[PDB]
RNA sequence: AGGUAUGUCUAACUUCUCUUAUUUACAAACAAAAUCAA
């Protein structure tokens, strides 16, 4: 019997974008022989990690480091009296101090010491989640949210040394907001806010700790009880000029305090407030404080929940005495930012927990302390200042922004073939389509006469050292010639009466045009004139099959018998022909040779029978043979510059594309790399780009596939344009890099520019003063009948309000005849929304208000007046909030809190057609989905999925299966009839399947007999009904099929029958914290056997390195060396529940980056294929499976 | 639902019964006892079907049909007022008691005549607590056949409690 | 020879405490010795 056992291949296509941690240190010295500068930053999101530099005033990707496979719960850089390397704490409790190093040709992250603490999980006892380092780098401190605090004393030597941990344990005191005070080397002092866990009243009390380097323990110093309203602590550096006595800034909600260590000085300064105070107004708070000091002037920046950015300076109050004062003022503010840094340069890096990280340079620096108007003082602690925010943005100037989606709420999958993902932007509220396809610009296109075929571009020999370049087009009957110059595109002898098989430049200032019947040898004469010095014709006449060429070299193949070899004479311009017969023993199909060099060995010949031969250019010999499928449609030979590999790119008829490694000396055919793209005979062309210079081959089919090879990797890709008939690299004085001249399949010339390429790190491009939209997006919708038309729905933060913005095709739509591209709905807020078509010709929209009211709308497309017109129809009161609804046949299928109502279409309001009462277990329905209108899968907050079946004439959904365990399901879909996808609030990605015992029953029986009537259940099921009525109430159970843990929270699953024409249908998910990843079902077995073995290798690979490094120490690198963190793979990915059949490809991908020594060291554990074939199978997934 | 089956040869086994009755209807469960002392089948089984429709069907078609080991297979489908009366006359027949108590209430069973101490007493079963109250009210401490009889509730301590009227009312309902 | 009439003959029924001892096996990759600038 065939084992179902779905084998899913997880990939992270785009890596988690919500940046939770940052560090200011200078890690690597790159591109400079000797340089030391403190300006650089490394930022971490849980697993994912990135390293940015500025140094230009504009932020720069340095390298995206390998996936750590853990949850980084804090990261802080340490600077010791040297290269500054960051201390990193995560799950496993391990304190892992890592240095970013340059190894081989890339930057890899090396670990120095990892210290075991607590256990492996995210815990309250776990001394993580609160971490800071002595600003002089003498000691690192970790703490726990509740139980205990540990502080290591860090020392540097020939090898780094971490001192034994210093423990303090307070059982009932829940710790929050660790903030360490800088010191002069006196003694390290850290400050916390301890809230008592077990108490009758809520008591939040600050506590000071001075670690004593002399006595080597942490000492409780001052315990100050403050109001329960407390928020956070910041460290005031010295106050050495005013009057060891550290001073802290305690942010409360509606006011700020600062407190002395000795309690002598406690200063209350009330935080100012906005003028509008829109709708709901909290007492607010300050989320993030930071400190800066220069030229005796130290100011701190503290930002409120509204994003208001404030400063504090200290004044002596010379009149009274020398004593500290506290002075608030107002700045440019910003959006809410989790953490703030400042370079030694005037650049202030704002890391926003909301969406985007952006960097500043401050000039105005803010208002002077002299003004009493807008500045508040500690003179009178009771006072209030109202201020209107300033969008003019005087103080701070945005230099660089980083496009990221931290809160991606929903998305729809648009343009299934190029995997394009349509999702909102949270703050800016712009439409973001992030795409797998290559980003392709289009500029100054021009309409060509109909029925065009191929294209070429050759430098104009007539004008030497000039921008003029000749562009050649082809029609079957006619050939068109065109002249290129900057901004000047003009039209022009040669042969216009016959199709052009080939044309190329020879040597210097010469051209040859090969056409079906005869050749032409053309040379430039004067400016607009050219002259053929010789012409070639078959002896008895013949139709030339194909032609290829090199720089100085040429080949043409006629109908059948012989092939013709040409060269150009050196020191002059001439053509010669050899006397010889290369009979080729068959009819030559197409010819290929390297045109990159003046002399190209190893011609590549194709045969109509479907075989490919090599020709040694002693002289000619056939060293290899390929029998491949259908006849070759087109083929190109290209040797890359970097590695010098000569690759033969062989396109085939019916749309199969192929690629071959070609040995230079032997000419053997090895390393077959195939693909299937579209249905059409493919076309190929060669282009050269950068992103270091680079070369790719464009492939023309139903789609357009650029095949490019990055370093030791290559990825075929679809391009953003729908189709391209013929493509060749182009250059213009108008700035052109990656620039290309091509033609659409419509027979229209166009110029374009490719920009971003889907590398392993990116795999996407994101198509989108300070800009913040008041409307925060809600959901995203798409019409069933229109294949892709995407409707967006947002909300207002304030008085309840909504907007609806519909887009189809390129950009949005107008609303009616109005200028506005969106619609505003007053007093309507959307808890959940879905669009429905009750009749095939009518389209309605569905809103569920927080007022518990169901609102119906009508969508209109104006069509060449084209605009969206929304129309309010009915009003219906609802009992529940309606968290989930969807399209059932002809009807709205909605879920109340308890029960599932199926509404029909009534007039003046919509009607309840049927109601289904849930089993007692289900409290609420988060999300639900249908299978072909027959079946449903209904999710819960607390409990798990339960599948229903619609019974006609019973007018009810009957639950036929329960779920095994309790799982909190955010989003849920169907792969099939019998299986279900689901995610968790906590990050589990699982897939369940109904048991075959149930599938036989439902396949062999009608649903009407389930609720009442005769259905014969095996003896065990009934005994489970009377024995365990609570679990088996639904009389079946989901056997766990696939389970996985992705640390994000999955927002949207989508099951795509094909990803960029790939055969294996994938399921792609976007997470909330932002991510998109896929689960690819693996066909056959040895696919998942080899993948499983590679994952098993990379799993303990760090341990294998540790045991080798151990044995060599027995005959004469820590344990977490290769993983950089203590977490095992199976442990991290297992976590909540063990992964079942899912093998994680995100691990096996890390095998690609390791050096050849390490890789060959790992693969020796297998009797199976060599490292090269390993990398083959690894890279096979992105190419072939999507 | 459940049917009794009997006149079974101990050589008839469980799989043989199952294969037998699946021919008639679907069989939910089979309880086919096994003697622990003799280590043998005691020759009667119980077959629980999926409903009394298939149960009664198998009772109709199966009864006196299948012949197993020459022996025929058999199939068969699987709280009132009580008054103690003392000092009755020796001339009082049970049928005379029936006639006496019929006027007051319908009798669910026949009276029970027994002798205490010499002392003729009887138990009379009424279908109704209220009709029993009638026979009590009229017949208590009365002279029949020139003998004084006492009519009260029989012990269970004696019938006629508060919960007794409540539940006997329901059993009437 | 045919037809009619008459007569006679013949055929056709379920859902093995405590106590104090003795006897005997068993478990725990349980531990095995010496030397001592340990």
UniProtKB/Swiss-Prot annotation, chain A:
Record carries keyword Nucleus: yes
Keywords, ordered alphabetically: mRNA processing, mRNA splicing, Nucleus, Spliceosome
Positions in coiled-coil regions: none
One Gene Ontology cellular component: U2-type prespliceosome
Molecular functions per Gene Ontology: U2 snRNA binding
The protein's name: Pre-mRNA-splicing factor RSE1
Highest classification ranks of the organism: Eukaryota, Fungi, Dikarya, Ascomycota, Saccharomycotina
Keyword check for Calcium: no
Organism: Saccharomyces cerevisiae (strain ATCC 204508 / S288c)
Function: Involved in G2/M transition. Required for pre-mRNA splicing and endoplasmic reticulum (ER) to Golgi secretion pathway. U2 snRNPs associated protein required for the pre-spliceosome assembly. The involvement in ER to Golgi secretion is probably indirect and due to the splicing of the pre-mRNA coding for SAR1, a small GTP-binding protein required for COPII vesicle formation from the ER.
Primary location: nucleus
UniProtKB/Swiss-Prot annotation, chain B:
SMART domains documented for this protein: RRM
One GO MF term attached to the UniProt entry: RNA binding
Entry's Gene Ontology BP terms: mRNA splicing, via spliceosome; U2-type prespliceosome assembly
Annotated localization: Nucleus
Domain RRM: 1-78, 81-156
Record's signal peptide: none
GO CC field: nucleus; spliceosomal complex; U2 snRNP; U2-type prespliceosome; U2-type spliceosomal complex
Keywords on record: mRNA processing, Nucleus, Repeat, RNA-binding
Pfam families with a match to the protein in the record: RRM_1
Chief place of localization: nucleus
Xref: PROSITE patterns: RRM
Superkingdom of origin organism: Eukaryota
Binding partners and assembly: Interacts with RDS3.
Misc note: Present with 1240 molecules/cell in log phase SD medium.
Role description: Possible SF3b-like factor.
Descriptive protein name: Protein HSH49
């Amino acid at each position: 019997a065939k084992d179902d056992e779905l084998y899913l291949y997880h990939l992270t296509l785009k890596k988690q974008t919500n940046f939770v941690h940052s560090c200011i240190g200078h890690f690597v010295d790159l591109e400079a022989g000797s340089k030391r500068e403190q300006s650089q930053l490394c930022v971490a999101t849980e697993t994912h990690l990135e390293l940015y530099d500025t140094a230009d005033g504009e932020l720069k990707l340095i390298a995206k480091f390998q996936n750590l496979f853990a949850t980084i719960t804090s990261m802080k850089s340490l600077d010791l009296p040297w290269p500054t390397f960051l201390a990193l704490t995560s799950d496993s409790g391990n304190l892992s101090i890592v240095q970013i190093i340059m190894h081989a040709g890339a930057l890899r992250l090396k670990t120095l010491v990892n210290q075991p603490l607590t256990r492996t999980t995210l815990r309250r006892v776990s001394p993580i989640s609160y971490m800071e380092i002595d600003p002089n780098g003498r000691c690192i401190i970790l703490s726990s949210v509740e139980q205990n605090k540990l502080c290591f004393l860090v020392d540097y030597a020939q090898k780094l040394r971490i001192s034994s941990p210093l423990e303090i344990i307070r059982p009932h005191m829940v710790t929050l907001d660790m903030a360490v005070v800088d010191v002069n080397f006196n003694n390290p002092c850290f400050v916390t806010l301890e809230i008592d866990n077990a108490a009758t009243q809520l008591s939040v009390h600050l506590i000071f700790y001075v670690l004593e380097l002399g006595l080597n323990h942490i000492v409780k110093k001052a315990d100050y009880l403050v109001n329960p309203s407390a928020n956070f602590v910041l460290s005031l550096p010295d106050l050495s000029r005013y009057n060891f006595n550290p001073f802290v800034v305690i942010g409360f909600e509606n006011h700020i305090l600062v407190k002395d260590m000795n309690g002598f000085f406690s200063l209350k300064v009330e935080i100012p407030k906005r003028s509008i105070t829109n709708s709901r107004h909290k007492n607010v708070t300050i989320i993030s404080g930071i400190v800066q000091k220069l030229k005796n002037d130290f100011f701190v920046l503290l930002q409120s929940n509204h994003g208001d950015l404030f400063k504090l300076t200290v004044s002596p109050d010379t009149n009274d005495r020398n004593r500290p004062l506290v002075q608030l003022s107002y700045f440019d503010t910003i959006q809410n930012s989790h953490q703030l840094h400042i370079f030694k340069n005037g650049y202030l890096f704002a890391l926003s927990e909301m969406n985007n990280n952006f960097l500043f340079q401050f000039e105005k620096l803010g208002v002077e302390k002299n003004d009493f108007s807008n500045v508040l003082t500690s003179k009178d602690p009771n006072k209030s200042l109202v201020f209107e925010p300033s969008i003019k943005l005087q103080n701070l100037s945005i230099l660089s922004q980083q496009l990221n989606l931290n809160p991606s709420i929903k998305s729809q999958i648009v343009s299934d073939s190029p995997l394009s993902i349509a999702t909102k932007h949270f703050t800016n509220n712009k439409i973001i389509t992030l795409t797998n396809a290559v980003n392709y610009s289009n500029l100054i296109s021009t309409s060509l006469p109909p029925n065009a075929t191929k294209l070429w571009l050759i430098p104009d020999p007539a004008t030497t050292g000039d921008n003029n370049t000749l562009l050649f087009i082809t029609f079957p009957k006619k050939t068109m010639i065109l002249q290129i110059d900057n901004e000047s595109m003009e039209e022009l002898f040669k042969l216009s009466q016959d199709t052009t098989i080939h044309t190329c430049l020879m040597g210097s200032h010469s051209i040859i045009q090969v056409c079906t019947a005869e050749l032409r040898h053309i040379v430039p004469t004067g400016k607009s004139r050219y002259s053929n010095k010789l012409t070639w014709v078959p002896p008895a006449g013949i139709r030339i099959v194909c032609a290829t060429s090199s720089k100085t070299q040429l080949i043409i193949s006629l109908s059948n018998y012989e092939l013709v070899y040409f060269k150009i004479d050196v020191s002059s311009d001439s053509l010669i022909e050899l006397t010889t017969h290369p009979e080729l023993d068959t009819m030559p199909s197409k010819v290929a040779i390297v045109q990159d060099t003046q002399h190209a060995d190893l011609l590549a010949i194709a045969d109509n029978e479907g075989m490919i031969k090599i020709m040694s250019l002693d002289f000619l010999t056939v060293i290899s043979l390929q029998l491949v499928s259908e006849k070759i449609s087109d083929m190109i030979m290209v040797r890359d510059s970097s590695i010098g590999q000569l690759n033969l790119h062989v396109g085939l008829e019916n749309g199969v594309y192929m690629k071959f490694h070609i040995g230079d000396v032997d000419g053997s055919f090895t390393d077959i790399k195939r693909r299937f793209l579209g249905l059409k005979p493919v076309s190929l062309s060669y282009l050269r780009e950068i992103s270091k210079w680079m070369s790719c081959v464009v492939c023309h089919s139903s789609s357009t596939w650029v095949s490019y090879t990055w370093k030791n990797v290559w990825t075929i890709r679809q391009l953003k344009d729908q189709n391209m008939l013929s493509c060749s690299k182009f250059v213009n004085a108008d700035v052109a890099i990656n620039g290309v001249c091509s033609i659409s399949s419509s027979g229209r010339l166009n110029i374009g520019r490719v920009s971003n390429f889907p590398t392993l790190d990116n795999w996407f491009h994101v198509h989108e003063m300070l800009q913040i939209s008041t409307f925060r997006p809600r959901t995203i919708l798409s019409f069933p009948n229109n294949p892709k038309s995407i409707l967006f729905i947002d909300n207002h933060s304030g008085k309840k309000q909504c907007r609806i913005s519909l887009q189809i095709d390129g950009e949005c739509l107008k609303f009616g005849s109005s200028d506005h591209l969106y619609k505003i709905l007053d007093d309507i807020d959307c808890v959940s929304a879905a669009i429905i078509d009750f009749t095939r010709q009518a389209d309605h929209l569905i809103i569920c208000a927080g007022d518990k009211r169901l609102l119906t709308y009508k969508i209109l497309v104006n069509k060449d007046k084209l605009s969206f017109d929304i129309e309010l129809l009915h009003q219906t009161e609802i009992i529940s909030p309606i968290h989930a609804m969807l399209k059932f046949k002809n009807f709205l299928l909605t879920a109340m809190g308890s029960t599932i109502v199926l509404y029909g279409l009534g007039k003046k309001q919509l009607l309840r057609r049927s109601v289904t009462q849930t089993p007692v277990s289900i409290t609420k329905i988060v999300s639900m989905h249908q299978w072909n209108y027959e079946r449903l899968a209904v999710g819960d907050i607390h409990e798990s999925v339960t599948l229903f079946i619609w019974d006609p004439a019973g007018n009810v959904f009957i639950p036929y299966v329960d779920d095994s365990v309790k799982r909190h399901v955010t989003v849920l879909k169907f792969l099939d009839e019998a299986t279900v996808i689901g995610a968790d609030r906590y990050g589990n990605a699982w897939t369940l399947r109904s048991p075959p015992e149930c599938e036989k029953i439902m396949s062999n029986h009608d649903p009407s007999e389930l609720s009442n009537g005769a259905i014969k259940y095996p003896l065990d099921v009934i005994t489970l009904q009377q024995k365990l009525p609570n679990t088996y109430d639904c009389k079946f159970k989901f056997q766990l099929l696939n389970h996985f843990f992705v640390n994000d929270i999955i927002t949207d699953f989508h099951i795509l029958d094909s990803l960029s024409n790939s055969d294996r249908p994938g399921c792609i998910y976007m997470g909330l914290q932002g991510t998109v990843g896929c689960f690819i079902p693996l066909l056959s077995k040895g696919n998942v056997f080899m993948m499983g073995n590679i994952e098993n290798i990379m799993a303990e690979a760090d341990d294998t390195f540790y045991l080798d490094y151990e044995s060599r120490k027995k005959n004469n690198i820590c344990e977490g060396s290769c993983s950089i963190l203590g977490r095992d793979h199976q442990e991290y990915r297992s976590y909540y529940a063990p992964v079942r059949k899912v093998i994680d490809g995100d691990l096996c991908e890390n095998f690609l980056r390791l050096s050849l020594n390490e890789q060959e060291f790992l693969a020796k554990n297998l009797k199976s294929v060599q490292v090269e074939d390993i990398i083959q199978t690894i890279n096979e997934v992105r190419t072939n499976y999507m | 639902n459940t049917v009794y089956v009997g006149n079974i040869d101990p050589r008839i086994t469980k799989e043989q019964l199952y294969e037998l009755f699946i021919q008639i209807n679907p069989v939910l469960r089979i309880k086919y006892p096994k003697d622990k002392v003799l280590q043998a089948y005691q020759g009667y089984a119980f077959i629980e079907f999926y409903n009394q429709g298939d149960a009664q069907y198998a009772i109709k078609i199966m009864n006196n049909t299948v012949r197993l080991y020459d022996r025929l297979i058999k199939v068969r489908q699987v709280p009132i007022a009580k008054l103690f009366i003392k000092n009755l006359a020796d001339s009082i027949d049970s049928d005379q008691l029936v006639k006496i108590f019929n006027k007051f209430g319908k009798l669910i069973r026949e009276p029970e005549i027994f002798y205490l101490s010499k002392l003729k007493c009887a138990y009379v079963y009424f279908e109704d607590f209220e009709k029993a109250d009638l026979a009590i009210k009229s017949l208590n401490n009365q002279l029949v056949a020139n003998n004084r009889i006492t009519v009260d509730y029989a012990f269970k301590n004696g019938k006629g409690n508060a919960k007794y009227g409540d539940d006997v009312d329901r059993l009437l309902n």
